[PDB]
């Protein structure tokens, strides 16, 4: 009942986590398993990590003619170029399941190949609880880049932005960067910054949390919100007074938004910073609606044109885990772990199982000539 993971390089360009990290491959082959490990150069992780964690070493791509049985695990979608049967099971975020573009041919090139899908991003347990998600790190890097643009609109004029950011190989390092531009704000006397996080009680509310203290912003300066205030329905006074407003809720129903445009303009607003961790371009009703555009790391701010009040910007960077690869992966491939022990029982295990029959469904969806 031997299980063999193969850990595909990641193509995706810039994408620096992996779904296996060094420390749960030594761990799987301490269960038994044996794991195949490609050579990545983007990746956060040194190949010799793996090697010395007793993982095979092989060449990147290898996985397209790897032995059949071998079950391909990967992080992010296959490139649409690729368009050749898919005869393994895969592991991955394949982004085929909510109508992307594409979707259909997506499952074809597994239906083609008769090949199986165990998507990520639908891995739960038994209450229906996902499995393993970036969370806290997106919470993390979210409100890392929010103190940073805090203290850059203190130390910089308003004709400046924040400039494009980078990852760091390290939590250490993030701290020790944004600390650094913290203090210099400081330094020109401005107060330590009052910040407002709604979601405070989630894994994102928690990293975000975590990073601020780590910092050094007191727990005095921070409002801890959840659904427990938010139900007093928006707009939010809170918001506009707090000079950093950090967002982990995703909501996409009609209901009034937690701030506006006419609550901002406002010459009494503190309010520098918005980091909307749970943005999504693609969201119907978007209950901060002062943003249409999704920053990423070359540019990761966009202004919010108000008419009064000083200069206001929002971070609506949807991969923010990617700001810190190595700690993101360590916590997802921990979390995904003991579903993975599960593998050898996929067939009967209700958490692949699920996994399963959803591939099922949505393949049934595919109706193609090719097919007959």
């Given amino acids: 009942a031997a299980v063999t993971l193969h850990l595909r390089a990641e193509t995706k360009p810039l994408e620096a986590r992996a779904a296996l990290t060094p420390t749960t491959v030594k761990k799987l082959i301490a269960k038994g398993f044996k794991i195949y490990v490609e050579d990545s150069p983007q990746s956060t992780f040194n190949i010799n990590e793996y090697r010395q964690a007793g993982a095979i070493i092989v060449p990147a791509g290898s996985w397209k003619t790897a032995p059949r049985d071998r079950i391909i695990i990967g992080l992010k979608e296959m490139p649409e170029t690729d368009t050749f049967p898919l005869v393994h099971e895969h592991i991955q975020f394949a982004h085929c399941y909510k109508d992307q573009a594409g979707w259909q041919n997506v499952l074809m090139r597994f239906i083609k190949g008769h090949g199986t899908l165990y998507d990520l991003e639908f891995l739960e347990n038994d209450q229906g609880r996902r499995v393993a998600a970036f969370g806290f790190y997106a ?38 960067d944004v600390t650094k531009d913290y203090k210099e704000a400081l330094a020109t006397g401005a107060r330590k ?53 950090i967002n982990c809720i995703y909501l996409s129903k009609p209901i009034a938004p937690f701030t506006n445009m006419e609550k901002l303009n406002n010459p009494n607003r503190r309010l520098r910073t918005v980091v909307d961790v749970s943005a999504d371009t693609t969201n119907p009703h978007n209950p901060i609606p002062i943003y249409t555009v999704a920053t990423v790391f070359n540019k990761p701010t966009v202004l919010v044109p108000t008419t009064a009040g000083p200069k206001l910007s929002v971070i609506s960077i949807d991969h923010l885990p990617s700001l810190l690869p190595r700690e993101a992966s360590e916590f997802f491939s921990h979390d995904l772990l003991p579903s993975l022990e599960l593998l050898p029982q996929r067939k009967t295990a209700p958490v692949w199982v699920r996994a399963k029959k959803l591939f099922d469904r949505h393949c049934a969806r595919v109706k193609r000539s090719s097919r007959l």
């Fill in 193 to 245: 910054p009052t910040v407002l996080i709604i979601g405070a009680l989630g894994r994102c509310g928690s990293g975000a949390i975590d990073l601020l203290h780590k910092v050094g912003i007191p727990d005095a300066n921070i409002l801890k919100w959840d659904i427990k205030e938010t139900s007093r329905g928006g707009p939010f006074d809170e918001i506009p007074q707090a000079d950093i407003f």
């Fill in 139 to 176: 919470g993390f890097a979210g409100a890392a880049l929010g103190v940073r643009d805090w203290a850059f609109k203190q130390t910089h004029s308003d004709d400046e932005d924040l400039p494009a950011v980078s990852p760091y190989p390290n939590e250490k390092a993030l701290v020790k």
